[PDB]
Amino acid sequence: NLEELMRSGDYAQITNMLLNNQPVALVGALPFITDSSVISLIAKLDATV
Amino acid sequence: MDVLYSLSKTLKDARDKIVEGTLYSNVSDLIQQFNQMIITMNGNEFQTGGIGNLPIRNWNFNFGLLGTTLLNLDANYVETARNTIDYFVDFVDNVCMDEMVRESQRNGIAPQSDSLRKLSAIKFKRINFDNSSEYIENWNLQNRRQRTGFTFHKPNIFPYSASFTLNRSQPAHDNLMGTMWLNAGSEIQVAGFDYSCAINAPANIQQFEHIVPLRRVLTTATITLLPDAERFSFPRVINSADGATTWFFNPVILRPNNVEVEFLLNGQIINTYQARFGTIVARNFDTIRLSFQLMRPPNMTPAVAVLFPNAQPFEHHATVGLTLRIESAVCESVLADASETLLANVTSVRQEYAIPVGPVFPPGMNWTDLITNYSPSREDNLQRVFTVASIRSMLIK
Amino acid sequence: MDVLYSLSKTLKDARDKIVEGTLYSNVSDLIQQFNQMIITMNGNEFQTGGIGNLPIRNWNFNFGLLGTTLLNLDANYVETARNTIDYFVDFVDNVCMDEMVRESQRNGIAPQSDSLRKLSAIKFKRINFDNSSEYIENWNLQNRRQRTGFTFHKPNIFPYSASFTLNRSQPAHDNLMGTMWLNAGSEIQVAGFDYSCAINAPANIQQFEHIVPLRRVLTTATITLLPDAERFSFPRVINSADGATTWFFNPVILRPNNVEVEFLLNGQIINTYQARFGTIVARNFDTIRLSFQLMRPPNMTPAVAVLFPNAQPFEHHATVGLTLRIESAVCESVLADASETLLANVTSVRQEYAIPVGPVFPPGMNWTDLITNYSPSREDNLQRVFTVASIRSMLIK
Amino acid sequence: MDVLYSLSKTLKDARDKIVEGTLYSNVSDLIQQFNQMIITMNGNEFQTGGIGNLPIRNWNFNFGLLGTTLLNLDANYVETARNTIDYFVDFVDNVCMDEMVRESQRNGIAPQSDSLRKLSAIKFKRINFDNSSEYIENWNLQNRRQRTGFTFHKPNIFPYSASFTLNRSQPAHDNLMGTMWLNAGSEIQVAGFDYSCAINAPANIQQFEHIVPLRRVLTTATITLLPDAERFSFPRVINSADGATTWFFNPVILRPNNVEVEFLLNGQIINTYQARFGTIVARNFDTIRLSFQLMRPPNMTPAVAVLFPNAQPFEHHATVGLTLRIESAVCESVLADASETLLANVTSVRQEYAIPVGPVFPPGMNWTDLITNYSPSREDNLQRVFTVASIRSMLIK
Amino acid sequence: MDVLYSLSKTLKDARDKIVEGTLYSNVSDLIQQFNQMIITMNGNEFQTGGIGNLPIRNWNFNFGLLGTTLLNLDANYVETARNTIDYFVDFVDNVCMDEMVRESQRNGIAPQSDSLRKLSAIKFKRINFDNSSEYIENWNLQNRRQRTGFTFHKPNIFPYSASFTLNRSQPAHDNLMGTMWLNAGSEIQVAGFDYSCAINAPANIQQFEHIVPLRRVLTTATITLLPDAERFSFPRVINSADGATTWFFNPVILRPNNVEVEFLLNGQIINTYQARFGTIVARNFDTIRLSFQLMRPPNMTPAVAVLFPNAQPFEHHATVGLTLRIESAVCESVLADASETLLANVTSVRQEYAIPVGPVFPPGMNWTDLITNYSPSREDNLQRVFTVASIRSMLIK
Ligand SMILES: [Zn+2]
Structure with missing residues (x-):
């Protein structure tokens, strides 16, 4: 949960699961970005944010 | 081996100290240990059993941390922790039964099961907790060649x-x-x-x-x-x-x-x-x-x-x-x-799951036949199995 | 019942850890428990005894908190705490003797004395401390229907x-x-x-x-x-x-x-x-x-x-x-x-205070007559009384 | 006497809790006790032995404090602490054998060796730690005239x-x-x-x-x-x-x-x-x-x-x-x-070092001769020696 | 087990209270329960049967909510709800017959079928409704060790x-x-x-x-x-x-x-x-x-x-x-x-689907052979099967 993560302040797992490449699903209500480019898909953009 | 005792020590203390209504300062240092168990164990996967009639089970750890913000613990905080302890305490039973059942003749003091060989990496060494029992203290003094x-x-x-x-x-x-x-x-x-x-x-x-x-x-x-x-x-x-x-x-x-x-x-x-x-x-x-x-x-x-x-x-x-x-x-x-009752826990596992006679121990774990020819190859196996049986007795009587 | 063990655990630790000359960081978490006992217990009043020759006593709690400001404990700090511990440890003796002496036939696992029924409110649940003894751990596992x-x-x-x-x-x-x-x-x-x-x-x-x-x-x-x-x-x-x-x-x-x-x-x-x-x-x-x-x-x-x-x-x-x-x-x-010696503590209380024969236990607590007809109504009473006798043995040998 | 138990309690816990890879918050209060042992003990000098074939040794303490700045303990931190524990645990063995071997007839409850008389000053009282064993709890209750x-x-x-x-x-x-x-x-x-x-x-x-x-x-x-x-x-x-x-x-x-x-x-x-x-x-x-x-x-x-x-x-x-x-x-x-085995530890020290027959105990520590005439002068000596034998059993089995 | 009774209670009430022409305030709290059943059950999938001649069926739930906007219910609102009730009431029949037919010897009070083990998660606990029947009230009082x-x-x-x-x-x-x-x-x-x-x-x-x-x-x-x-x-x-x-x-x-x-x-x-x-x-x-x-x-x-x-x-x-x-x-x-007729419902399921003799119950469910040796292992199985037979009797006579 992104909200309970935000209220607690102590992360300690989102740091670990991201540094050591762990599979994860972040439940939230984010806004997104649309993208219409094959060059931006080959360039591996979605894993850099 | 040292981290298998350290898993069982802080699951025994988690069922004893995390009770309803207790003050938070009583459990302020256990939760820092219990959260740091979970961070080390996530993402890994294990496999126990396979010998005799002992069934094959697969283990997978994906849990969340405990909260560190209450003043007195309530029934939400207890019931969300009991359904995490009950998965770990089922994992430790099947690792301890996987190790009491196996034996070797070359070097019996080494771990024999697949799960306990995997727990002996330096990744898992941060789970290590105090070693205050009698058999885990004599496991460490004798491993450095000191008198036990x-x-x-x-x-x-x-x-x-x-x-x-x-x-x-x-x-x-x-x-x-x-x-x-x-x-x-x-x-x-x-x-x-x-x-x-x-x-x-x-x-x-x-x-x-x-x-x-x-x-x-x-x-x-x-x-x-x-x-x-x-x-x-x-x-x-x-x-x-x-x-x-x-x-x-x-x-x-x-x-x-x-x-x-x-x-x-x-x-x-x-x-x-x-x-x-x-x-x-x-x-x-x-x-x-x-x-x-x-x-x-x-x-x-x-x-x-x-x-x-x-x-x-x-x-x-x-x-x-x-x-x-x-x-x-x-x-x-x-x-x-x-x-x-450490001898009775070892034989009761081998008799229940119909385990074949191996190269070291006598058939049926006969104590008269085992103390008669009490070789140094049997001594290293017997200490390795009584120590695992002592770890299992903390969680499951 | 769970809070009666929690009173005796932190009175045993208060006589052991609060000694003269010790460092304050050794007892920094016990005093937060011992002060939080006193806040819960003040203003209440109790009454024990009444059956047989067991005398009637009235209990009343009006005490002050302990100081949390020294670096090493001195003889003023010890002697002002011993005259608070000695009143609580006299209270727990007379609640444990009031419960080992009573019995019921419908539901023997419930508390029977007047004081232990009053301690089972949610007001007193914040006194709860760790439950690490053998009989209080099997009291809790069996109360949830788990294997003991x-x-x-x-x-x-x-x-x-x-x-x-x-x-x-x-x-x-x-x-x-x-x-x-x-x-x-x-x-x-x-x-x-x-x-x-x-x-x-x-x-x-x-x-x-x-x-x-x-x-x-x-x-x-x-x-x-x-x-x-x-x-x-x-x-x-x-x-x-x-x-x-x-x-x-x-x-x-x-x-x-x-x-x-x-x-x-x-x-x-x-x-x-x-x-x-x-x-x-x-x-x-x-x-x-x-x-x-x-x-x-x-x-x-x-x-x-x-x-x-x-x-x-x-x-x-x-x-x-x-x-x-x-x-x-x-x-x-x-x-x-x-x-x-848990059987010997139960019979010695009943023999000393001349207690009449009740509806459940045999006359004189005869163990040959009790294991012969060991009904499930006698099993629930016998566990409830051996557990109270185990709590009293921590404070008073 | 109370500070001799307090030396052995935090050397037992130092070999158990200071292990490799453990979290620092598990040992954050032991190191404050172990550093405060060392500060009190530096600059002093002691002398044990001299009776029978027990050799004379001189003791001298000049050590440095432990570090309080890591997050997880490493192998440098363990190996620099083991060569400090191993000097203290050799000192406590030779004080406990110096006291189990001596006896007096006027007041046997007082310390008899030269080192234990010197540890009974108010300078050494800040080493005092919890007193939770059975024999050290009955040493303190009986010293205030309470029932043991x-x-x-x-x-x-x-x-x-x-x-x-x-x-x-x-x-x-x-x-x-x-x-x-x-x-x-x-x-x-x-x-x-x-x-x-x-x-x-x-x-x-x-x-x-x-x-x-x-x-x-x-x-x-x-x-x-x-x-x-x-x-x-x-x-x-x-x-x-x-x-x-x-x-x-x-x-x-x-x-x-x-x-x-x-x-x-x-x-x-x-x-x-x-x-x-x-x-x-x-x-x-x-x-x-x-x-x-x-x-x-x-x-x-x-x-x-x-x-x-x-x-x-x-x-x-x-x-x-x-x-x-x-x-x-x-x-x-x-x-x-x-x-x-507290009687067996006392006689084995006296038999090993060829100790002459003193004024109180029977020749050879004969238990049939000692319980026959069990005078109050022998009771005060026998409690003083069984309590020292209980302290030595924590460190050296 | 508690949520299997809660499925059958609000399907019995849905066929009784949702009738044509009734006022909406009569059913204003049932529809909030019945809609909240559906939200929990969607997306899941189940599998029942497999033992004896009991056929294997697969279950899949994808339904829509009920309307909450009428004043008096009409024939559109009834006929669109009957074709949802008739799929759930067919699902509960095949879970209850899957559980009355299975048995275990170690712990018979636990669920044995594959579907009832899956319903015992905390995801499905929000379907829980009142527990007012005789057998589900004695299921809960006896699970906390109270007198039934x-x-x-x-x-x-x-x-x-x-x-x-x-x-x-x-x-x-x-x-x-x-x-x-x-x-x-x-x-x-x-x-x-x-x-x-x-x-x-x-x-x-x-x-x-x-x-x-x-x-x-x-x-x-x-x-x-x-x-x-x-x-x-x-x-x-x-x-x-x-x-x-x-x-x-x-x-x-x-x-x-x-x-x-x-x-x-x-x-x-x-x-x-x-x-x-x-x-x-x-x-x-x-x-x-x-x-x-x-x-x-x-x-x-x-x-x-x-x-x-x-x-x-x-x-x-x-x-x-x-x-x-x-x-x-x-x-x-x-x-x-x-x-x-709870004994007659259990034997009629086993006789109809040609079920082999298991390890616990007598062959043919002979009541003379079952009350003769009425062990505590048979008592836990017999209560678990009479309680499931009582749930099935509400929906299907
Ligand atoms: Zn014996």
């Missing part, structure tokens, strides 16, 4: 043995001499007999002796010595040495004369006691040497003098015996005793 | 019984057959006899059997088996079945032939052992079935052959016996044993 | 004694009456006999009695009572009272009639039990009074009636016996028992 | 038994004495007979007795007692004990003299009734002890005196009997009775 010690109450140091020895015999079996004994558990009952009652012995004294060697060296024992063997006191019929015929033994019992008990170590007399019954000590020994003798009484009332004639028909046979019993001692290798 | 277990050293599982059975008899009592036994504590000594020594039996073999049912199911026992009953080995005179006449029994003792010990569970054979003496295990059982037989020896020396004629006057009677002994086992209900 | 208690398993309360008493005798020794007994450890086996089998007694009943006084008052005992003395059941020959002649004893055994066991305290009957065998309790007593009687059976089959004639030749002598055994009890003074 | 109770009308507490006992017999079978009985269902008919009609008995009175032990403890029973056994009143021929020969029994019937009925609990007399027929109560018992005696009438008319001679040919045999019948009682374990 286990304290026992009535240790099973003697294998079962019940036999005799005839120093004088004939096929009629009516004029005999020798000793009889029972060595079982932690108790020795020896009894010497003489049918003629020393009528032709020099100075009417017959000498007896019985020497019991041990398998391991005991230290600071408390021993009770009583001057009667109550088991070899009644009339019985006994077979011969090769099972051919039977012979009759009708005892009357005198008191043991000139008793000397010696406690040897590499042939050196450490302790000795001469006509001193009751409780005695024995600081360091590995061989017990009992010595006692029969003396014909020089003065006899008319009711006694009919029992012991000069001629051949002896209907009442003289008997002199002792009784020794070890109450508590300190050994350095693992053994079995009368207080703790 | 108590570890015993020589458990009193057998009621006292000493009797016999005659499978062949006549009013002269000179040609008999049957078994004799003693079941007492944790030890079985059975012995079978035959006066004719199987002179007319088919293949000169006489079969014996003795079946002992248990009251509760034992788990992972360590059992010692020895091939002689030393109690039924000497000549004695025994009364008849209805106390009319007496009969004489003069034994000689052969060895037991073809011994089979079986360990049953709902009529299913869990374990079996055939001519295997010494130490054995028994993983799960509730019925012990001993089987052994007498065989006439086919070859006899002239000293033996006079003992067993073909005609009627039999002056030397054949005897075959066994001996079984449970060293340690794990049960699920509470029992008595040889190591801990 | 030690829990034992089979306590050695009876000195060794094996003798008899003849209430009717003649120089032929063929018509006798009296009792025989064995008192050893925690077990009483008394047996009364009568050769005439009450043929001329009034109402054919012969009364027996055996009274055993204790040395210290026991509390809440669990006692097993069985109606046979198995040791006085076989034929034997016994010397006379002054060792002049020998006399013969050929028993047959009836059951004990009208058994009454009483538990006295200052001549007042606390408990009583009438024909009730099995397990019994005894809440407070210091004298056991056994009473039992022989009754001639009024109806006898022809096999029994030949044994007991009216005339003088009695070839089969009647015998009635009992058996008592204390399983566990609570005393207030220190004793020896079957579970713990 | 089931109310029965004529409970099947006695296994079927019809036999006799001869206290006096000879191979001619013409002078006999003893009792006959029938124990079946909830009724005891015992009858004692004597062929000589007490012509040589002391004071012409013959004593009879019949003791019936129960399997479980009954509470607050209503019992009818009538002074005649109508089943043992006519002439019949009966086989011998070993089936060798047959013997004849021609009764005449006197009235029972001196009737005493006792109601025991652990050997203690709870209730007693002396010559009191009709309806009686029994508050707490587990053993019924009937006692009655035959008395020869001292005065006889000439038509009676011919029936009972002094010599040997007895053509009219005396008979005295009783009759007991339990109308209603309260037990704590589950049983069978004469009012409800």
Whole structure:
């Protein structure tokens, strides 16, 4: 949960699961970005944010 | 191995300290340990079982941390932690049963199961917690070559043995001499007999002796010595040495004369006691040497003098015996005793899942066959399995 | 009940950790527990006693908090805390004696005294501390329906019984057959006899059997088996079945032939052992079935052959016996044993204050009468009283 | 004395909690204790040994503090602390052996060695840590005159004694009456006999009695009572009272009639039990009074009636016996028992270093001679030495 | 298990309360429950059946919510809800038949089918509704260890038994004495007979007795007692004990003299009734002890005196009997009775789908074989299956 993560302040797992490449699903209500480019898909953009 | 004890120590404390209504400062340092278990264990996957009828299970850890923000713990905080503890405590049962069931002959002190070999990486070393139990403290002192010690109450140091020895015999079996004994558990009952009652012995004294060697060296024992063997006191019929015929033994019992008990170590007399019954000590020994003798009484009332004639028909046979019993001692290798149930947990797992006979242990985990030939290859396996059985006893009785 | 253990745990630790000269960081978390006891307990008032000769006392709590500002504790800080601990430790004695003395028949697992019913409110739940003892851990696992277990050293599982059975008899009592036994504590000594020594039996073999049912199911026992009953080995005179006449029994003792010990569970054979003496295990059982037989020896020396004629006057009677002994086992209900003194604390309170016989327990707390009819209504009362007796043993020996 | 336990408690915890890879918050309060040991102990110098063959060693403390800045402990932090612990744990061994070996007669409860007198200053009182063991808790409660208690398993309360008493005798020794007994450890086996089998007694009943006084008052005992003395059941020959002649004893055994066991305290009957065998309790007593009687059976089959004639030749002598055994009890003074090895650690130090016989203890630390004359001057020495032996057992097994 | 009852409770109420034309405020709180069922159940998938001839079906839930906007419900709103209820009520039938058919021996109180193990997650706990039935209330009180109770009308507490006992017999079978009985269902008919009609008995009175032990403890029973056994009143021929020969029994019937009925609990007399027929109560018992005696009438008319001679040919045999019948009682374990059909629903599922004999229940679900050996392992299975059979009876009769 992104909200309970935000209220607690102590992360300690989102740091670990991201540094050591762990599979994860972040439940939230984010806004997104649309993208219409094959060059931006080959360039591996979605894993850099 | 050190991190398998550290998983069970903080799951035992998590069911005891995380209760409803308790103050947060009572559990403020356990939760920092329990959260740091979970961070190390996530993302990994394990596999236990496969031998005998022990089923194959797969383990996978994806859990969330505990909250660190309450003042008094409530029923939401307890019930969200019990459904995490109950998955770990099921994992530790199936790793401990996977290790008590396996054995090796080259180096038995190494881990044998697939899961315990994987827990011995430096990734999992941060789960390490205090090592305060008796078996995990002696696991660490002995791993650095320092002196260890286990304290026992009535240790099973003697294998079962019940036999005799005839120093004088004939096929009629009516004029005999020798000793009889029972060595079982932690108790020795020896009894010497003489049918003629020393009528032709020099100075009417017959000498007896019985020497019991041990398998391991005991230290600071408390021993009770009583001057009667109550088991070899009644009339019985006994077979011969090769099972051919039977012979009759009708005892009357005198008191043991000139008793000397010696406690040897590499042939050196450490302790000795001469006509001193009751409780005695024995600081360091590995061989017990009992010595006692029969003396014909020089003065006899008319009711006694009919029992012991000069001629051949002896209907009442003289008997002199002792009784020794070890109450508590300190050994350095693992053994079995009368207080703790570590031998019973090992055999009950092997009998339940129909485990085949391996290369090291006797068939059926027979303790009489295991202490008889107690090789250093069996000692390293027996310590490795009693220590895992001690870890499992904290969580699951 | 959970908060009665939590009062005694932090009064035991308060006499141990709050000593003179100690560093403040050693006791920095105990004082936060001990101050939070006092805040909950102030303003309340209690009343204990009233049954038998147990006197009525009134309790009232108005105390002040402890200081949290020193670096090393001094003699002012110790002596101002000892006169607060000594009032609480007198309160817990009179609540524990008020609960060990009362009993109910409908639901015995509920609290019965007036003070312990009042401590079971949600106001008093913040006094709750860790639950690490054996009896308070099994109080909580069994309250959620999870599997428990108590570890015993020589458990009193057998009621006292000493009797016999005659499978062949006549009013002269000179040609008999049957078994004799003693079941007492944790030890079985059975012995079978035959006066004719199987002179007319088919293949000169006489079969014996003795079946002992248990009251509760034992788990992972360590059992010692020895091939002689030393109690039924000497000549004695025994009364008849209805106390009319007496009969004489003069034994000689052969060895037991073809011994089979079986360990049953709902009529299913869990374990079996055939001519295997010494130490054995028994993983799960509730019925012990001993089987052994007498065989006439086919070859006899002239000293033996006079003992067993073909005609009627039999002056030397054949005897075959066994001996079984449970060293340690794990049960699920509470029992008595040889190591801990929880039964002795319960009876000593009832005998001292002249307590009348209630509806559940036998008169005088007779353990032979209580394990004979060990109903589920008596099991819930006996666990509730042994657990209170375990709490009182931490403070007052 | 209180600071000698406090040195050993935080050296035991330092080898258990300071391990490789552990989190720093697990050991954050131990290091504040261990650093504050070192600050107090630096600059001082000590001297142990000197009596017997115990060598003289000089001790000098100049060490540095431990680091308080890591997050997880590494192998540099462990290996720099092990070479500080190993010097302190060698110091505590030689202070504990210096104190178990010395004794005084005026005030034995005071420290006797040179090092333990120096540790009893107010400079060293800041090393004081929690006092949670059994012997150090009873050291402090008894030092303020509060009630203490030690829990034992089979306590050695009876000195060794094996003798008899003849209430009717003649120089032929063929018509006798009296009792025989064995008192050893925690077990009483008394047996009364009568050769005439009450043929001329009034109402054919012969009364027996055996009274055993204790040395210290026991509390809440669990006692097993069985109606046979198995040791006085076989034929034997016994010397006379002054060792002049020998006399013969050929028993047959009836059951004990009208058994009454009483538990006295200052001549007042606390408990009583009438024909009730099995397990019994005894809440407070210091004298056991056994009473039992022989009754001639009024109806006898022809096999029994030949044994007991009216005339003088009695070839089969009647015998009635009992058996008592204390399983566990609570005393207030220190004793020896079957579970713990505190007596064995004291004698093994004195035997190893060839220590001369002092003014208080018996030669060779004979427990039969020490419980026979158990003076209050020996009680204060025996508690002071068992408590030091309990401190040494934490570090060095 | 708790959520399986909660599915069936709000499908029963949905077919009853959602009718055509009803006001919306009558069903305003049911629709909030029924919509919140659907939200939890969507997206999941299940699988039932597989054992015996029970077919395998797959379940998948993708439904839409109900409308919450009408004032009176119309035929569109009913017919769009009936085609959702009819899919759920078919799902609950196949989960209840999947659970009544399976059994385990280790822990039978746990769910055994694949679907009911999946419903026991915390995701499905929000479907939980009120628990007001008798079996689901006793499922929850007994799961927390509180006292429960089931109310029965004529409970099947006695296994079927019809036999006799001869206290006096000879191979001619013409002078006999003893009792006959029938124990079946909830009724005891015992009858004692004597062929000589007490012509040589002391004071012409013959004593009879019949003791019936129960399997479980009954509470607050209503019992009818009538002074005649109508089943043992006519002439019949009966086989011998070993089936060798047959013997004849021609009764005449006197009235029972001196009737005493006792109601025991652990050997203690709870209730007693002396010559009191009709309806009686029994508050707490587990053993019924009937006692009655035959008395020869001292005065006889000439038509009676011919029936009972002094010599040997007895053509009219005396008979005295009783009759007991339990109308209603309260037990704590589950049983069978004469009012409800929970035993008939369990056996009809197993017989229909040809289910093999498992490890726990008798072959064919024989109630005489199941109440004879009514072990605690069978009690936990029998409660788990009667409770599932009670849930299925709400939806499908
Ligand atoms: Zn013991």
